């Protein structure tokens, strides 16, 4: 139902202790329909790229709050050759907002690709 | 015209296992290395799936220093609207005799006052 989300840069901790910021900009041809930008912290242990902004990017829709968004992991600091996309939802029901989020993560380990998956979990950092 | 550069030439259409087509469209990130803006349209024929055949936009990011991507749809157009969206990620595998685009999805959408994501997988050749 939600407003403050569309209107601010809001930020979202996942469980990992990653940051996610959001931006929404309406669509110009898809009704209730939103461009995400932003920037992605990483600071999952295990993972490279870590504690760096990287733009994210994706599409949100209002209707029930759901979102997909990706990140190239390619900045000025570090380049780990590779991109995650997180879908999910947001639920706003609790005192505290969260995102339930699955992903996927394409890699290459020398000639070999890869994609692996997992789940982020973030709650609004208010 | 190696295969990785006919990607990024122009349109290409890629389709799936399901018979639905991803149209890509690229452009240069205006802050990333090695990086681009995946813009384009996508129409769906996968069995048991709404929102079948129109057109609906895509947006992603594609890295081209070993051709990863990951895109992103929401299924709400003027023909249809799912309540719903899928977020594919993947690599482009130039080793085999055709290209193959080999992505794992997730579609997030609600049944009823329940939300839940599904997971599966889509293989993409050239059209
Ligand atoms: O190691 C890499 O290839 C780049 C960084 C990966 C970070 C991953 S993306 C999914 C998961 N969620 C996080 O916040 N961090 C990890
Ligand atoms: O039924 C819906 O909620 C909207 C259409 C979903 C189509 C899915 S997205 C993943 C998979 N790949 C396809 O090409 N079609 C299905």
Same mark, same amino acid.
């Given at each position: 139902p939600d407003m403050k989300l569309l209107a601010g840069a809001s930020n979202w901790v996942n469980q990992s202790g990653s940051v996610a910021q959001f931006v929404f900009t309406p669509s110009p041809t898809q009704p209730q329909t939103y461009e995400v930008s932003g920037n992605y912290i990483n600071n999952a242990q295990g993972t490279g790229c870590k504690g760096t902004p990287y733009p994210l990017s994706g599409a949100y829709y209002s209707g029930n709050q759901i979102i997909s968004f990706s990140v190239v992991w390619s900045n000025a600091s570090a380049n780990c050759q590779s991109a $995650?996309? #997180?879908?999910?939802? *947001?639920?706003?029901?609790?005192?505290? @907002?969260?995102?339930? $989020?699955? #992903?996927?993560?394409? *890699?290459?380990?020398?000639?070999?690709? @890869?994609?692996?998956?997992g789940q982020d979990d973030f709650m609004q950092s208010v």
């Amino acid at each position: 139902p939600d407003m403050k989300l569309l209107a601010g840069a809001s930020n979202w901790v996942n469980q990992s202790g990653s940051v996610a910021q959001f931006v929404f900009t309406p669509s110009p041809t898809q009704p209730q329909t939103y461009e995400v930008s932003g920037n992605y912290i990483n600071n999952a242990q295990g993972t490279g790229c870590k504690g760096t902004p990287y733009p994210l990017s994706g599409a949100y829709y209002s209707g029930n709050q759901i979102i997909s968004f990706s990140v190239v992991w390619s900045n000025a600091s570090a380049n780990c050759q590779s991109a $995650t996309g #997180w879908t999910g939802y *947001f639920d706003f029901s609790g005192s505290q @907002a969260v995102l339930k $989020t699955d #992903w996927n993560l394409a *890699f290459y380990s020398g000639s070999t690709p @890869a994609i692996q998956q997992g789940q982020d979990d973030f709650m609004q950092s208010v």
